[model samples]
Target: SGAIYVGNYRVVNRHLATHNDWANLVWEDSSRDLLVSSTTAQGCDTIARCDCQTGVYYCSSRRKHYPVSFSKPSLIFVEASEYYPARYQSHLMLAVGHSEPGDCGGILRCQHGVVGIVSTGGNGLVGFADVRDLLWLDEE
Candidate 1:
């Protein structure tokens, strides 16, 4: 059998709608959920499931990409810690980006769920202290 990669891996957000120009991408784990950093003012962080099945590309919400004019990118995941049990031994990939002059942010592909995290700077691209968890909040 193939070796299972565990822990966190850095990745870059490529989606246009979600990824702005190119900014640093950071992620956090809160249980089994995964959240992305946002670059908006509304502070709307996108939420998703980390244990998504194979062959599934986009998230169920379909609202993966957030704008880049709201707040900075700074999100965290909630339910992602449970999927990587010894039995599964799956690896987690994190999306990172290159800092541009006026870039928005980057993206990543979680096991299943993936959402954008909103803050005071921008969507998925900014510097913030309190990283919001998307599982607890409802859609706008």
Candidate 2:
């Protein structure tokens, strides 16, 4: 896949989520032209609401495409805290595992539309940051 600059390195703002395992990167849309450009960016089919508890999803990239088995949420605390404040932690993620080696930044999808981004995984279990939490990343 080709590359698109979400922002220059200096523009990045990191927000550690309530969960110990995940965080989000916020950056200026420095290259608006490239963001929607087909040559450098491959857009997901559509953005959809994620149903963590009952949804089965799929993970894909140019390398692989397969169904992800739904599983219990891992290592995530149910309560919000002062230090680990909530952002989009509630029903904003998916619990899944795949047969193939999961890659960071792969697209997670379901029957309706796009679900999340492949964030972290090991021992076949994978974590995805919900698309609902990310709709504001390129804010004007």
Candidate 3:
């Protein structure tokens, strides 16, 4: 029921008003959601949130132009291993050349639920900005 794509890319998704900047040109959908409600944090064993070593999946655009992905639109999957601190107060994940320059804004999902968004990626690693603020304390 939530399959709304434009041309060759997926479009239908939820967003937060506080975190997402809809009018921003560079990062229009800065805080985006894929309609998947998470049960817990990536590595947090309990309801409390905490950054831990875990496996994460990110959806990145496969267009060469990076910023624009309209004509030859598609996405690539990156299976990254969570790191202590990526950068810009983000969670760092290493995947060995799996992500690209325009991989930012990609959804970062873990076994529990949506954890962060791809802010930057390169040189065999990717940085994800945590989105736990949009979620409730007990987001199960």
Candidate 4:
């Protein structure tokens, strides 16, 4: 099945325009846009701005302590996998492994154009994987 691929990086800030307990992060892409995903005013919504320059792949959120927020930015890494189609499958698996620092970790999968997060924690590792998928290719 095909799914929407969305990734983000998060942070925390006490001095926000609306709420003190604000969650912030950046969304990574070729454009490097600035995005604010906050959970204030009784609901959650996102605000994105195209302020990034070309060749830039990373940006900081509007908050301090870059934690994972719904609208926050996430580190995106692409890799290969053996369980997906050769043309439309994702070559990357987002994961936060067990040997990571701090108190945040989990696994996020991106395949078949789908990006899904599986877990979260601290003192863990979060990133993507590059696997060798032989099943998708025929000895060509």
Candidate 5:
């Protein structure tokens, strides 16, 4: 098979939430396009969330901030779903972390593709740990 996705930079107005609160972050649809952006613009609305494991009110893009184990790593996820036609890029954003003025972050993706993890001064609970899997030459 060929490339499963077409990667494109975007001005993603985001929404941050955990596995539990994630279902409520969608305020409404936004009208924008990621196809021809001259600059990268990003922003989001972070909801009140707690750690899926520790039940602590903490989340971000880096895994070191809180405690986690390989058996059951802390679940601090991300999401950026554009429900409008104009802003359609077939992108699926995962709110992997949550915080402000830190390395918090999230993961961006599309069908059969990973667009790398993004950080907001430690926003997500993990930082780009999925890179290896995304960039793997598995087909080689």
Candidate 6:
């Protein structure tokens, strides 16, 4: 059986857009409803408006990737922890997403429903992808 990923958004805000991005990515549990939407944002994940919809869950609103990030190499998404400092993982993350010359192999991570990145310095930024951004996994 595939691993089950149950996501809970620890953070959510409406008054602020950046603050709300992560919050919008959280999945709400439903047994009777076909629509996956947020009662707070008044938004639906997908406007497909039809049945038998699966994969690429869409949302009326979600965070987006920045232009600078598109230039970076695609990253290998990993479940990361905030309990520890970002320094430990930033290297491996960067290597997968960064180009040429310097290969720090940096990593940036986000917690449940969080859209963010981290940088120790000069090396580069990690966690550039928004929670909802479509990311290609590194190396088949």
Best by TM-score: 2
Q: What is the C-alpha local distance difference test score of candidate 6?
A: 0.22
Best by lDDT: 2
- Which portions of model 1 show Cα errors greater than 4 Å? 1-46, 51-97, 115-132
CA lDDT for candidate 2:
0.38
Which candidate do you rate higher for TM-score, 2 or 6? 2
Off by over 4 Å in 2: 1-44, 50-62, 71-102, 133-140
Which parts of model 5 have CA positions greater than 4 angstroms off?
A: 1-8, 14-36, 40-61, 64-105, 115-140
Question: How far does residue 84 in candidate 5 sit from its true spot (Å)?
Answer: 16
Q: Which regions of candidate 4 deviate over 4 angstroms?
A: 1-43, 53-77, 81-140
What value does the lDDT take at residue 72 in candidate 4? Answer: 26
Candidates in order have lDDT scores of 0.27, 0.38, 0.36, 0.23, 0.27, 0.22
TM-score of each: 0.22, 0.43, 0.38, 0.17, 0.19, 0.21
lDDT of 3 by residue, 9-125 (tens): 222233322222233212223223232322222433222144433535444454321221111111333333232232223123334334654465565444455444454455655
lDDT of model number 5 = 0.27
When sorted by lDDT, best at the front, the candidate numbers are 2, 3, 5, 1, 4, 6
Candidate 4 minimal-lDDT segment of 10 residues: 51-60
Model 1 residue 58 lDDT?
20
How well is each residue in 1-140 modelled by candidate 4, as lDDT tens digits?
Answer: 11111223222111111232122422222111112333333322122222111110111121122222122233433232232122221232333333221221122222232122222222343332121221211111
The window of 10 residues in a row where model 5 has the poorest summed lDDT is 1-10
lDDT of 5 at 115: 34
